[PDB]
Curated annotation (Swiss-Prot):
Enzyme class name: lyase
Gene name per UniProt: emtA
Keywords attached to this entry: Cell outer membrane, Cell wall biogenesis/degradation, Lipoprotein, Lyase, Membrane, Palmitate, Signal
One GO cellular component, as annotated: cell outer membrane
InterPro entries xrefs: EmtA, Lysozyme-like_dom_sf, Transglyc_AS, Transglycosylase_SLT_dom_1
Name of the molecule in the record: Endo-type membrane-bound lytic murein transglycosylase A
Any GO MF annotation of the entry: peptidoglycan lytic transglycosylase activity
Membrane topology: Lipid-anchor
Post-translational modification: The N-terminus is blocked.
Its EC number(s): 4.2.2.n2
HAMAP family: EmtA
Protein backbone atom coordinates (compact mmCIF):
# COMPACT_ATOMS: atom_id res chain seq x y z
CA UNK A 1 0.00 0.00 0.00
CA UNK A 2 2.00 3.09 1.23
CA UNK A 3 4.58 4.17 -1.44
CA UNK A 4 6.94 4.88 1.42
CA UNK A 5 10.21 5.26 -0.57
CA UNK A 6 8.74 8.17 -2.68
CA UNK A 7 10.21 10.76 -2.96
CA UNK A 8 13.79 9.71 -2.12
CA UNK A 9 15.10 11.26 1.06
CA UNK A 10 18.71 12.39 0.87
CA UNK A 11 20.15 11.97 4.36
CA UNK A 12 23.69 13.33 3.81
CA UNK A 13 23.38 16.87 5.05
CA UNK A 14 20.71 16.16 7.76
CA UNK A 15 23.12 13.56 9.11
CA UNK A 16 26.20 15.75 8.92
CA UNK A 17 24.36 18.38 10.93
CA UNK A 18 22.98 15.80 13.39
CA UNK A 19 26.48 14.29 13.83
CA UNK A 20 27.77 17.49 15.44
CA UNK A 21 25.48 16.52 18.39
CA UNK A 22 26.82 12.95 18.63
CA UNK A 23 28.87 13.72 21.81
CA UNK A 24 25.52 14.63 23.53
CA UNK A 25 23.67 11.74 21.94
CA UNK A 26 26.32 9.32 23.25
CA UNK A 27 26.12 10.74 26.79
CA UNK A 28 22.34 10.91 26.95
CA UNK A 29 21.90 7.53 25.27
CA UNK A 30 24.22 5.86 27.77
CA UNK A 31 22.37 7.59 30.60
CA UNK A 32 18.98 6.30 29.40
CA UNK A 33 20.19 2.99 27.93
CA UNK A 34 19.13 4.26 24.49
CA UNK A 35 21.05 3.71 21.23
CA UNK A 36 22.99 6.92 20.27
CA UNK A 37 22.72 5.94 16.61
CA UNK A 38 18.89 5.97 16.89
CA UNK A 39 18.97 9.35 18.68
CA UNK A 40 21.20 10.77 15.94
CA UNK A 41 18.94 9.38 13.18
CA UNK A 42 15.92 10.98 14.85
CA UNK A 43 17.69 14.32 15.12
CA UNK A 44 18.53 14.17 11.40
CA UNK A 45 14.95 13.21 10.44
CA UNK A 46 13.19 15.69 12.80
CA UNK A 47 15.16 18.97 13.07
CA UNK A 48 17.92 18.12 10.56
CA UNK A 49 20.32 19.07 13.38
CA UNK A 50 18.86 22.55 14.04
CA UNK A 51 18.50 23.06 17.81
CA UNK A 52 16.06 25.94 17.25
CA UNK A 53 13.64 23.77 15.28
CA UNK A 54 9.86 24.16 15.63
CA UNK A 55 7.51 21.53 14.22
CA UNK A 56 4.04 20.01 14.39
CA UNK A 57 2.05 21.50 17.23
CA UNK A 58 5.07 23.40 18.64
CA UNK A 59 7.25 20.32 19.00
CA UNK A 60 10.65 21.94 19.67
CA UNK A 61 14.37 21.44 19.20
CA UNK A 62 16.78 18.79 17.94
CA UNK A 63 14.42 15.85 18.45
CA UNK A 64 11.24 17.96 17.95
CA UNK A 65 9.73 16.96 21.26
CA UNK A 66 6.32 18.41 22.31
CA UNK A 67 6.28 19.82 25.91
CA UNK A 68 2.72 19.22 26.81
CA UNK A 69 2.62 15.55 25.72
CA UNK A 70 5.97 13.80 25.40
CA UNK A 71 7.82 16.26 27.61
CA UNK A 72 5.21 15.95 30.32
CA UNK A 73 5.40 12.14 30.05
CA UNK A 74 9.15 12.35 30.76
CA UNK A 75 8.64 14.71 33.71
CA UNK A 76 5.98 12.41 35.14
CA UNK A 77 8.14 9.30 34.90
CA UNK A 78 11.11 11.71 36.62
CA UNK A 79 8.66 12.46 39.47
CA UNK A 80 8.78 16.12 38.46
CA UNK A 81 5.77 18.41 38.36
CA UNK A 82 4.90 20.15 35.17
CA UNK A 83 6.56 19.95 31.81
CA UNK A 84 9.63 21.39 30.07
CA UNK A 85 9.63 24.97 28.82
CA UNK A 86 10.26 26.08 25.28
CA UNK A 87 13.69 27.47 26.24
CA UNK A 88 14.62 24.15 27.92
CA UNK A 89 13.71 22.25 24.74
CA UNK A 90 15.84 24.62 22.65
CA UNK A 91 18.84 23.67 24.82
CA UNK A 92 20.63 20.82 22.92
CA UNK A 93 21.64 18.95 26.07
CA UNK A 94 18.20 19.12 27.69
CA UNK A 95 16.46 18.32 24.40
CA UNK A 96 18.44 15.17 23.68
CA UNK A 97 18.23 14.04 27.34
CA UNK A 98 14.39 14.30 27.19
CA UNK A 99 14.18 12.67 23.80
CA UNK A 100 16.30 9.79 25.01
CA UNK A 101 14.05 9.60 28.10
CA UNK A 102 10.95 9.46 25.87
CA UNK A 103 12.50 6.73 23.70
CA UNK A 104 13.21 4.81 26.94
CA UNK A 105 9.55 5.27 28.03
CA UNK A 106 8.39 3.76 24.71
CA UNK A 107 10.89 0.86 24.81
CA UNK A 108 10.25 -0.09 28.41
CA UNK A 109 6.53 0.64 28.38
CA UNK A 110 4.16 -0.03 25.46
CA UNK A 111 6.89 -1.80 23.46
CA UNK A 112 8.24 -3.93 26.37
CA UNK A 113 8.87 -7.52 25.39
CA UNK A 114 10.03 -7.09 21.78
CA UNK A 115 13.07 -9.45 21.69
CA UNK A 116 14.61 -8.66 18.25
CA UNK A 117 16.47 -5.31 18.74
CA UNK A 118 16.12 -4.44 15.04
CA UNK A 119 12.32 -4.91 15.12
CA UNK A 120 12.35 -2.86 18.32
CA UNK A 121 14.23 -0.07 16.51
CA UNK A 122 11.63 0.00 13.74
CA UNK A 123 8.75 -0.11 16.30
CA UNK A 124 10.40 2.77 18.22
CA UNK A 125 10.55 5.12 15.25
CA UNK A 126 6.96 4.22 14.20
CA UNK A 127 5.83 4.87 17.79
CA UNK A 128 7.82 8.15 17.99
CA UNK A 129 6.13 9.22 14.67
CA UNK A 130 2.46 8.41 15.34
CA UNK A 131 2.24 6.78 18.80
CA UNK A 132 2.55 3.24 20.10
CA UNK A 133 -1.25 2.76 20.13
CA UNK A 134 -1.78 3.11 16.39
CA UNK A 135 1.05 0.63 15.78
CA UNK A 136 -0.11 -1.97 18.31
CA UNK A 137 -3.75 -1.81 17.18
CA UNK A 138 -2.60 -2.89 13.67
CA UNK A 139 -1.85 -6.25 15.44
CA UNK A 140 -4.39 -6.57 18.32
CA UNK A 141 -6.65 -4.60 20.68
CA UNK A 142 -4.69 -6.40 23.44
CA UNK A 143 -1.14 -5.13 24.16
CA UNK A 144 0.25 -8.53 25.16
CA UNK A 145 -1.15 -10.23 22.06
CA UNK A 146 0.12 -7.39 19.81
CA UNK A 147 3.65 -7.81 21.25
CA UNK A 148 3.40 -11.58 20.75
CA UNK A 149 2.54 -11.04 17.08
CA UNK A 150 5.37 -8.49 16.63
CA UNK A 151 7.80 -11.09 18.09
CA UNK A 152 6.98 -13.51 15.27
CA UNK A 153 8.24 -11.12 12.57
CA UNK A 154 11.70 -10.13 11.38
CA UNK A 155 12.49 -6.51 10.57
CA UNK A 156 11.67 -6.75 6.86
CA UNK A 157 8.37 -8.40 7.66
CA UNK A 158 7.59 -5.72 10.29
CA UNK A 159 8.20 -2.93 7.73
CA UNK A 160 5.99 -4.71 5.16
CA UNK A 161 3.25 -5.08 7.82
CA UNK A 162 3.49 -1.36 8.66
CA UNK A 163 3.48 -0.40 4.99
CA UNK A 164 0.34 -2.47 4.25
CA UNK A 165 -1.65 -1.85 7.48
CA UNK A 166 -0.64 1.30 9.39
CA UNK A 167 -3.03 4.20 8.81
CA UNK A 168 -0.32 6.87 8.94
CA UNK A 169 1.68 7.32 5.73
CA UNK A 170 4.49 8.72 7.96
CA UNK A 171 4.91 5.36 9.67
CA UNK A 172 6.60 3.23 6.97
CA UNK A 173 8.28 6.37 5.67
CA UNK A 174 10.04 6.86 9.07
CA UNK A 175 11.52 3.34 8.75
CA UNK A 176 12.73 4.20 5.22
CA UNK A 177 14.26 7.47 6.45
CA UNK A 178 15.84 5.71 9.49
CA UNK A 179 17.69 3.41 7.15
CA UNK A 180 18.74 6.27 4.87
CA UNK A 181 20.15 8.02 8.00
CA UNK A 182 21.93 4.92 9.36
CA UNK A 183 23.56 4.39 5.96
CA UNK A 184 24.69 8.02 5.78
CA UNK A 185 26.15 7.79 9.33
CA UNK A 186 28.54 5.06 8.07
CA UNK A 187 30.52 7.77 6.22
CA UNK A 188 31.40 9.33 9.62
CA UNK A 189 33.05 6.26 11.24
CA UNK A 190 36.62 5.44 10.14
Amino acid sequence: KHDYTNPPWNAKVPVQRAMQWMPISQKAGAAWGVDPQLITAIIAIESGGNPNAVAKSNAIGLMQLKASTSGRDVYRRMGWSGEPTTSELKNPERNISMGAAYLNILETGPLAGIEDPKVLQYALVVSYANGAGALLRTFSSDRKKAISKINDLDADEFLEHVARNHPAPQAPRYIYKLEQALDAMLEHHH
